């Protein structure tokens, strides 16, 4: 455990209820990632299945319009995880 966390949570393309995001992988070897998303009033969820290693972008579906969701993206190492890297935006 104890691994750095991704950075610069960016957004690729954005759909009326889906949202693509792009980050800068942490500074340590990893074999997976976690990505949650939040909204005012409802608790976070996780992008499933967990992203693959080597990818610096993920899409998030199942959102709501006119709503800026807050994403928490983490680095994994065999279910093990690092600190989060968050960023929010609207669909």
């Amino acid at each position: 455990g104890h691994m750095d966390a991704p950075s610069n949570l960016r957004f690729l393309a954005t759909t009326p209820n889906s949202l693509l995001v792009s980050w800068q992988p942490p500074r340590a070897r990893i074999t997976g990632y976690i990505i949650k998303y939040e909204k005012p009033g409802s608790p976070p969820r996780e992008v499933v299945p967990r992203p693959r290693p080597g990818v610096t972008e993920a899409t998030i579906t199942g959102l709501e319009p006119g709503t800026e969701y807050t994403i928490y993206v983490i680095a994994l190492k065999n279910n093990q995880k690092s600190e989060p890297l968050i960023g929010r935006k609207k669909t």
Side-chain angles (χ1 to χ4, degrees):
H2 192 92
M3 312 189 299
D4 307 289
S7 338
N8 276 340
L9 208 166
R10 298 163 60 207
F11 312 122
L12 295 297
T14 66
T15 1
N17 283 110
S18 311
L19 218 312
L20 241 177
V21 317
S22 61
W23 66 87
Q24 201 286 326
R27 197 179 193 177
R29 281 202 313 197
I30 41 87
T31 192
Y33 306 88
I34 266 296
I35 304 174
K36 317 185 228 174
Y37 55 98
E38 255 194 83
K39 41 154 301 194
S42 208
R45 284 223 188 184
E46 185 209 286
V47 181
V48 173
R50 309 149 197 200
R52 79 103 67 173
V55 77
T56 69
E57 88 194 290
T59 306
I60 292 146
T61 56
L63 317 207
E64 275 179 70
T67 272
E68 73 186 291
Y69 277 80
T70 285
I71 284 59
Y72 291 66
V73 13
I74 244 105
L76 255 61
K77 193 183 73 66
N78 302 34
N79 182 270
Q80 285 167 27
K81 352 188 317 188
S82 60
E83 298 171 90
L85 181 269
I86 300 125
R88 83 195 167 207
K89 196 100 178 181
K90 200 266 290 291
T91 57

